[PDB]
């Protein structure tokens, strides 16, 4: 009985070592491990016969549905195409913004202006919008 218990403890200790090197010392991008809310900082304390972990997670609420586009292009010049970085292009519903499209973050709804910091240049695709006037990245 003791030999079996000792071996299972050694295997469990190997799992603890892996969690300290992926959840305690770094931010995890894997999901699975930890509470299911992506992952931010985790902590370790000593327990009887082992380690006790605490994982702070980020949990969503109050979801809404919005209209979004795959990407945007210049209607006058097909090589000028952009796609959002770490976020989405959404139809504007905010009274501060005077543009048809707006940028929002992936994990939190908040409209912002579309600028060069929020985007990347891509090859054109048939699903991208054909914008006839106001685009600031690229201005042309």
């Amino acid at each position, epitope marked *: 009985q003791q030999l079996v218990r000792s071996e299972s403890a050694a295997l469990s200790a190997q799992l603890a070592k892996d969690k300290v090197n992926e959840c305690v010392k770094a931010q995890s991008k894997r999901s699975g491990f930890c509470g299911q809310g992506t992952h931010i900082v985790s902590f370790v304390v000593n327990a009887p016969n082992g380690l006790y972990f605490m994982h702070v997670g980020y949990y969503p609420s109050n979801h809404i549905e919005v209209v979004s586009a795959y990407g945007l292009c210049d209607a006058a010049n097909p090589t000028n195409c952009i796609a959002p970085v770490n976020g989405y292009f959404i139809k504007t519903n*905010n*009274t*501060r*913004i*005077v543009d048809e499209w707006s940028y929002t973050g992936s994990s939190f709804y908040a409209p912002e202006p579309i600028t060069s910091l929020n985007t990347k240049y891509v090859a054109p695709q048939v699903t991208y919008q054909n914008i006839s006037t106001n685009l600031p990245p690229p201005l042309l």
Partner: antibody
Framework: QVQLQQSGPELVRPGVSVKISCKGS????????IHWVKQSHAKSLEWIGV????????NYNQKFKGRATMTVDKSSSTAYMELARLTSEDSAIYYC???????????????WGQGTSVT | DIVLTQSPASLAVSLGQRATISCRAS??????????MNWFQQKPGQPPKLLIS???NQGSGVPARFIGSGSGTDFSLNIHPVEEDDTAMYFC?????????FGGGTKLEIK
């Protein structure tokens, strides 16, 4: 208690660059863009432009794009429209109006300023 | 820009009568099912006033008396109990595309 206090009317002579002001009151001025409109007749009105009061970004009607420009005085909660090179065809009633979204993704002109005129 | 036109140029109805206004667009203004059609009201001595918007027949500053309808290129306003304080110019407004132009409008009258 929303107000849009336009500056008073004037018979301005041609060739002047004419500035008109509109003062917001009773609400947070920086959260709403201001639309500007020209009325030459009871049945002839046209959009002039829109001014973001947070970011300063603008759009203009193409016919006035090289004539009309818009600016802000955030400390006085006021927006201005200045129209270069006045001519007799600009004699009109001018308005300012608050942007809104009563319906999702549909621009509305909400509360309007009382009207001013230039001639 | 898409051109908006409206008919009849003026309409006279008796007090308490239903009345309608027809509105026509040169190209359809539906994009993503949104419609983007607003109706406005003006009297002499006044600014234009927002009445309704595409999904808001009640709300947007009015009672359910102002019924917007239609889709594509054809829109209408329908008011079932007209009174003399509804006599005003009425306009179709496009919110879909720049530079946001709008119709010449029609005049409601009383018989």
């Amino acid at each position: 208690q929303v107000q849009l206090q336009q500056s008073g009317p004037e018979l301005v002579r041609p060739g002047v660059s004419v500035k008109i002001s509109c003062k917001g009151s009773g609400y947070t001025f920086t959260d709403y863009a201001i639309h500007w409109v020209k009325q030459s007749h009871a049945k002839s009105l046209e959009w002039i432009g829109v001014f973001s009061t947070y970011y300063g970004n603008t759009n203009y009607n193409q016919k006035f794009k090289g004539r009309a420009t818009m600016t802000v005085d955030k400390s006085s909660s006021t927006a201005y429209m200045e129209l270069a090179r006045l001519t007799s065809e600009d004699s009109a009633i001018y308005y300012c109006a608050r942007k809104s979204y009563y319906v999702d993704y549909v621009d509305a002109m909400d509360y309007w300023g009382q009207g001013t005129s230039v001639t | 820009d898409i051109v908006l036109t409206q008919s009849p140029a003026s309409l006279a109805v008796s007090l308490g009568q239903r009345a309608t206004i027809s509105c026509r667009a040169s190209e359809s203004v539906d994009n993503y099912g949104i419609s983007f059609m607003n109706w406005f009201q003006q009297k002499p001595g006044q600014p234009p006033k927002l009445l309704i918007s595409a999904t808001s027949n009640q709300g947007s500053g009015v009672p359910a008396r102002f019924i917007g309808s239609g889709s594509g290129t054809d829109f209408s306003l329908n008011i079932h109990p007209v009174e003399e304080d509804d006599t005003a110019m009425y306009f179709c407004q496009q919110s879909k595309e720049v530079p946001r132009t709008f119709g010449g409008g029609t005049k409601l009258e009383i018989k």
